[PDB]
Design a protein around this ligand. Structure first.
Ligand code: AMP
Length: 362
């Protein structure tokens, strides 16, 4: 602790919110990463595993659940800026087995914005590509694609699958061999390697059992990433153009294009945003859209990537709870990782309090 140092003030702000949060929710371990003024701060708390006990360190890997959807979008955006994908084309244009199905009328943009109408969860009985394609050929949305927003793991799966195919590789290769390496995210994985298993935190479910996420079909696209807070802070900085990584920077920025309004949010390519300065009530409402259908209204022409917005994404698994938010105009961002799935309203509120503390009022 030092005087006249913003770092000590930030640590106090973060500690004072995170310690009670972890106590009352019984969260075993967290890492919080903050960037502001071009400086990066990483704060680690508690335990990556209870038995045998292992502390959270700079190397601890957390499951981030739906933060993974933003990587599928970044890959699709990379394919798009590389000339391999048009977001306005239909899904069946790129997946010829689906020609003649309802996917003749669902665009890639629809699956990238949760506006196809596909339901939230993949049917549990779908285990292989044959069963998946049979389901998709038989599926019909309740409303015309493009009229409603239904947050969807399945649609995100299609987005990433199409993006990878357009690049000539599997999704796993696209992410681990192309995207994460080009972003400099060397401790981010869909499959944690043997030399990193000691760093892979256990998640603690509602009954406090240690669990790791089970990876099923198209799951890598929707929920597969394990990563460190430092790697995600780099991802946040890259999303704010702060790093010397040109196609990749274009791809990152273009994911922030605003395509639909729904409720309080602007739906980008997987990322979600609200105008900044943003009120806590609207941010909370905008982060309570995970399981219900809402009306979606197109933004056409699309809203270009903005500076004056709060861009964010939640992610969870049975054992983990994560959140990212950043405001490009202020070059400030936060990553909050936990090995217990605690409520989104608390993640958002803590992040709002932290970011609001980072400069004076004017
Ligand atoms: P985001 O973190 O909002 O959502 C992804 C998490 O939802 C759960 N989940 C999605 N899809 C499935 C399937 N098919 N089976 C079991 N669980 C699923 C996971 O917790 C994801 O991490």
């Amino acid at each position: 602790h030092h005087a006249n140092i913003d770092e000590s003030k930030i640590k106090d702000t973060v500690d004072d919110l995170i310690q009670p949060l972890m106590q009352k929710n019984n969260i075993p371990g967290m890492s919080v990463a903050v960037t502001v003024n071009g400086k990066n701060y990483i704060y680690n708390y508690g335990l990556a595993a209870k038995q045998p006990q292992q502390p959270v360190t700079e190397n601890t890997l957390f499951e981030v659940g739906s933060l993974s959807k933003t990587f599928a979008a970044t890959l699709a955006s990379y394919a798009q800026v590389s000339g391999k994908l048009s977001l306005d084309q239909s899904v069946s244009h790129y997946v010829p087995e689906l020609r003649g199905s309802s996917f003749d009328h669902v665009s890639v943009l629809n699956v990238g914005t949760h506006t196809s109408g596909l339901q939230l969860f993949m049917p549990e009985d779908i285990k292989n590509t044959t069963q998946l394609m049979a389901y998709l050929k038989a599926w019909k949305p309740a409303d015309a694609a493009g009229t409603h927003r239904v947050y969807s793991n399945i649609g995100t799966g299609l987005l990433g699958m199409i993006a990878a195919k357009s690049l000539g590789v599997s999704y796993e290769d696209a992410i681990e061999k192309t995207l994460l390496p080009q972003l400099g995210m060397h401790h981010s994985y869909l499959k944690v390697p043997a030399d990193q298993m000691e760093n892979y935190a256990w998640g603690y479910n509602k009954k406090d059992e240690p669990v790791h996420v089970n990876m099923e079909i198209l799951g890598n696209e929707a929920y597969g990433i394990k990563t460190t807070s430092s790697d995600l802070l780099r991802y946040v900085q890259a999303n704010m153009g702060q790093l010397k990584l040109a196609k990749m920077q274009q791809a990152l920025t273009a994911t922030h294009t605003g395509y639909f309004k729904s409720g309080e949010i602007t739906q980008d390519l997987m990322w979600e945003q609200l105008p900044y300065p943003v009120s806590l009530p609207n941010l909370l409402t905008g982060n309570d859209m995970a399981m219900t259908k809402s009306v979606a209204t197109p933004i056409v022409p699309p809203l270009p990537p903005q500076e004056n917005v709060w861009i964010n994404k939640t992610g969870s698994t049975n054992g983990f709870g994560a959140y990212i938010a950043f405001v490009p105009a202020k070059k400030m961002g936060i990553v909050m990782l936990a090995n217990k799935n605690y409520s989104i309203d608390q993640r958002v509120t803590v992040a709002y309090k932290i970011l609001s503390s980072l400069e004076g009022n004017k």
